[PDB]
Design a protein around this ligand. Structure first.
Ligand SMILES: C#CCN(Cc1ccc2[nH]c(N)nc(=O)c2c1)c1ccc(C(=O)N[C@@H](CCC(=O)O)C(=O)O)cc1
Ligand SMILES: C#CCN(Cc1ccc2[nH]c(N)nc(=O)c2c1)c1ccc(C(=O)N[C@@H](CCC(=O)O)C(=O)O)cc1
Ligand SMILES: *c1cc(=O)[nH]c(=O)n1[C@H]1C[C@H](O)[C@@H](COP(=O)(O)O)O1
Ligand SMILES: *c1cc(=O)[nH]c(=O)n1[C@H]1C[C@H](O)[C@@H](COP(=O)(O)O)O1
Lengths: 264, 264
């Protein structure tokens, strides 16, 4: 996508060499924002083939409040394997915080349900937020939440959403993060009878790993193809009842995939 | 400031009329980002006179982990009066979450201290964050955190910080929020022996209240004056030992102040 390729180029041009937790090394910039008008098409990277199966199942997995990779394995999705323990657990990551944020007084808060109620009863609220950054449980998490905080907004019958991603692996992670959230917006909009608005992506430490340079140069030589259309065949009873089969991406003709090692 | 006046104009030009919690009405946009190179000067609005006393004391108050307006009254700062209860309490807002985030298991986490340790022992960390959005305690808060989540970044010996502000009152609140955080960055940089980098401000629902239109038009007719210089006279033992007297803003010659009613 145009916005995506411009960001890659921006990092190569303005990125500062920086060491990182994985010991891989990166070219990094801090603070970037881009916007995707969901009405223009589904923001799925076309300059390289993205594995839809992984993207979709990861989101449904988050929505189930699941943090054990079992569900993913049942569906042949292995994207989280390297961080799970012997029992396949990742700790109280995304799913757990979204569906059951533990309070100091023993209660559990379902942020998704709360969000649905706010969208349906108070669309003008400036507090329609979901946060995975649970300070009191970070030490139990296998990997601190990258996409950590998002907010919904409703204007002119359209639903928008802004995601704050503290750390962004531009080559491997970003394509997944963008598509994933664009999907959630469509789902939320469907459940709330709203049109899709904009997906605003805001990043903190946005970087390209040193061992993704050839991949990056290769991808930058490609021309972006028309964005596909997302078709949701059915309207489930709730946001928690979607199935992989309910989604259709029409007209997705990407360039060939590009393999790149993941920094653990 | 140029960035600030451009945002005001942007809201007037692209803002959508929207109702809000206060019943005042606003012109609103969603998703905006601006950057201030702290090396260029202290980002204090010059097109209208800002009350430094309030700004500074509010930050020191946050740092003490205080949430009762008593300290503010002792110092003649009344900016939070309308939301405090009979006993002057505001609930577990900013100060409390920064200094004593309550965990489910009874512990309390000092995020500022944690941040200092990360900056000093692991400056390359992509997880140097402080969050005031405590989902489990929002119901006890007098007003949900506007400036809710910020992240520090270190590159080339310089300290940067990005703030995610979910809701922004462009006329009254923004000047305070920008100056306040720019100050915290200088303080943090001093304590960590780093140069100041950039302050990246990212907003969610960014708006102008309907009853601030005349004020806005008046301010937009003014020319921004050179930014002042922040001088920190002393280097305290810790980030928690600063005093109002330690700060000096050199060359602050603003246009006259503009009164505007606050939406409760
Ligand atoms: C974001 C996110 C979720 N995640 C989780 C996740 C966890 C740790 C991370 N760590 C690093 N260094 N970068 C990441 O983007 C990252 C992502 C992903 C993990 C792996 C792939 C990945 O390797 N994708 C391959 C597809 C391989 C497959 O089909 O299994 C690709 O080529 O895109 C994508 C997303
Ligand atoms: C941000 C923030 C902190 N806060 C707290 C705070 C709480 C609720 C809010 N609610 C609304 N509608 N807008 C706000 O910006 C806002 C800000 C502030 C509160 C008041 C003023 C204010 O009235 N300022 C006057 C100065 C008056 C004085 O000296 O006491 C001004 O003209 O700027 C500024 C900041
Ligand atoms: C984390 C998972 C995700 O959803 N998207 C991402 O891009 N990532 C990336 C960020 C970073 O490269 C690495 C996590 O490392 P760190 O915690 O930031 O040090 O995975
Ligand atoms: C809140 C306090 C602050 O630090 N800065 C701000 O601009 N505000 C504003 C945002 C909004 O106008 C109002 C809070 O209302 P709401 O919770 O967003 O409905 O004060």
């Amino acid at each position: 996508m145009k916005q995506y390729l411009e960001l890659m180029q921006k990092v190569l041009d303005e990125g500062t060499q920086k060491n990182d937790r994985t010991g891989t090394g990166t070219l990094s910039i801090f603070g970037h924002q881009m916007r995707f008008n969901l009405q223009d098409g589904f923001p799925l990277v076309t300059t390289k083939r993205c594995h839809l199966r992984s993207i979709i199942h990861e989101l449904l997995w988050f929505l189930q409040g699941d943090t054990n990779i079992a569900y993913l394995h049942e569906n042949n999705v292995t994207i989280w394997d390297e961080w799970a323990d012997e029992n396949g657990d990742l700790g109280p990551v995304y799913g757990k915080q979204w569906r059951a944020w533990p309070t100091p007084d023993g209660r559990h808060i379902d942020q998704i349900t709360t969000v649905l109620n706010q969208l349906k009863n108070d669309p003008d609220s400036r507090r329609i937020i979901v946060s995975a950054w649970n300070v009191g449980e970070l030490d139990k998490m296998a990997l601190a939440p990258c996409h950590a905080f998002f907010q919904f907004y409703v204007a002119d019958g359209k639903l928008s959403c802004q995601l704050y991603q503290r750390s962004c692996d531009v080559f491997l992670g970003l394509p997944f993060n963008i598509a994933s959230y664009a999907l959630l917006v469509h789902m939320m909009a469907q459940q709330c009878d709203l049109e899709v608005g904009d997906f605003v992506w805001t990043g903190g430490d946005t970087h390209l790993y040193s061992n993704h340079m050839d991949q990056t140069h290769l991808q930058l030589s490609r021309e972006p193809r028309p964005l596909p259309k997302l078709i949701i065949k059915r309207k489930p009873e709730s946001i928690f009842d979607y199935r992989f089969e309910d989604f259709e991406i029409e007209g997705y003709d990407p360039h060939p995939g590009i393999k790149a090692p993941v920094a653990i």
